[PDB]
């Protein structure tokens, strides 16, 4: 659920829609609905550009891509009613046929984007990048149809041109420029350690210091023979200055390649730190809940804060003793810090993590990381006991 932490972004979108509606209604009322869809198409491209101001307005990157999907579905709904009320399956002029091609690509990509869970991510991304061709085709359709009406000195020309230019510049940056210029942190892998049968820890030495807060993540691009160079998001699992740690559990084809084939010395590139789950920014009393490899944001805090200044209760859940990581680190940290409580929950042995009879501290923030299904159940039970509790959760999926 959205809140005031994402109200700057929401007010920007409603300002974009209200201003577009007023500009069209006062100039060309017959084109309010196609005009509104072009603004939504512009905002969808902006919301996919991955800019620091984007997540500063929409709180988290998960909420950025949720709105990115909402403006995508609003666009196709308005374009379908544009096509239904203004034309047919195929157009008679070249200008109309450009809008026919664009709507076919827009509907085909949106259909594939939604029910494309089983496709490979890079194949999905390449298919997804066809909206730029449809977006360009739509811009030809608009400017061939409304010739000399959006190329004068008036409000409508400035409004249509600016949003069309912003979407054109946003689509070019993320598709052709983001992975080439927005990855300024060049580094190489120094040491690699296998924690358990399916998790590997990567130590990276960067040529320049990396600034991040515990609980934040980055995007990793590995440059090795036999490795894909696409960016994968990983939580920073420790390190300071020119040293970064990443803890990767085999989840698919790339993460199994990291476990088995990754070698020390391979070049890596980082873009910047993302994330709203800043542990240091929480209350004095904190509750940490981690599931499986969701412990990685909490390992950065433990490594970087040898003395704990907060009242932290840690609830770690793992699939038996064979799927637990950093067990000696957590035991050593609890011994050094009296104000740190460790609660190891073997799912097979102990059972389920339940907060019904458990008591949360008064005026405490709950940081939750792990499976989405397990987090939702846990978040519900905490709110019944103390509705004033502040709950912060980070997921591992954008789609
Ligand atoms: C904010 C965040 C933090 C994360 N932190 C960690 C971490 O500390 N440790 C860890 O092991 N994993 C972490 N992940 C998950 C990690 O990004 C994926 O598990 C990994 O990219 C899967 O690689 P694969 O291609 O082998 O998996 P696949 O089998 O190809 O993918 C399966 C799942 O991974 C997703 N996925 C695949 N490729 C990408 C990609 N390039 N970008 C985004 N999602 C992708 C798919 O949507 C699907 O849900 C994090 C994810 C997010 C969003
Ligand atoms: N910041 C981020 O976004 C980060 C994302 N991640 C993601 O975190 C995820 C964690 O998954 P993984 O490492 O495989 O861990 P698992 O899902 O395998 O284990 C997590 C634990 O949750 C328990 N659990 C599941 N459902 C419930 C429930 N309803 N109530 C209580 N306990 C429950 C399981 O016990 P049981 O066997 O009884 O179900 C299990 O021990 C990964 O998908 C990873 O990609 C990783 C790092 C950080
Ligand atoms: C008019 C509709 C849409 C447009 C114009 C659009 C545009 C884009 C673009 C250009 C990208 C970046 C591609 C790249 O990095 O190469 C992107 C990313 C993304 N889009 Fe869309 N999209 C649309 C619809 C959708 C829909 C329907 C979904 C449904 C899930 C979706 C989910 C995503 C996600 C999750 C990403 C993140 C990609 C990543 O993690 O690498 N988009 N979008
Ligand atoms: C400000 C935005 C827009 C304006 C002013 C506009 C204007 C028009 C006009 C006048 C027509 C009538 C076609 C004809 O001359 O016979 C038309 C048709 C159409 N437009 Fe647009 N349009 C806009 C946006 C879009 C966009 C962005 C798309 C597609 C992505 C689109 C898709 C279509 C389709 C499919 C038709 C039907 C073509 C046909 O059957 O002949 N429109 N538009």
Numbering used by the authors: 2 to 400
Task: Give the article text.
Evolutionarily distant proteins with the NOX catalytic core have been found in bacteria, including Streptococcus pneumoniae NOX (SpNOX), which is proposed as a model for studying NOXs because of its high activity and stability in detergent micelles. NOXs belong to the ferric reductase transmembrane component-like domain (FRD) superfamily and are composed of a catalytic core with two conserved domains: a domain with six transmembrane helices (TM domain) coordinating two hemes by four conserved histidine residues and a C-terminal cytosolic dehydrogenase domain (DH domain) containing the flavin adenine dinucleotide (FAD)-binding and NADPH-binding sites. The DH domain catalyzes a hydride transfer to FAD, which subsequently transfers electrons stepwise to the two transmembrane hemes. The structure of SpNOX corresponds to the canonical NOX structure, with an N-terminal TM domain that coordinates two hemes and a C-terminal DH domain bound to FAD.
We present here cryo-electron microscopy structures of substrate-free and nicotinamide adenine dinucleotide (NADH)-bound SpNOX and of NADPH-bound wild-type and F397A SpNOX under turnover conditions. These high-resolution structures provide insights into the electron-transfer pathway and reveal a hydride-transfer mechanism regulated by the displacement of F397. As for other members of the FNR superfamily, a transient displacement of a C-terminal aromatic residue is necessary to perform hydride transfer. Here, we analyzed the steady-state kinetics of an F397A SpNOX mutant. Similarly to nNOS, we did not observe a large effect on the KM, which suggests that F397 does not have a major role in the control of NADPH-binding affinity in SpNOX. As for the F397S SpNOX mutant described in the previous study, we observed a moderate increase in kcat, which could be explained by the elimination of the F397 displacement step. These data are supported by further analysis of a cryo-EM structure of the F397A mutant bound to NADPH under turnover conditions at 2.64-Å resolution. Density can be observed for the bound substrate but, compared to the other substrate-bound structures described here, the nicotinamide is closer to the isoalloxazine ring. The absence of the large side chain of F397 allows NADPH to take up a productive conformation in SpNOX for pea FNR Y308 mutants. In this conformation, the nicotinamide ring does not lie parallel to the isoalloxazine ring but at a ~26° angle.
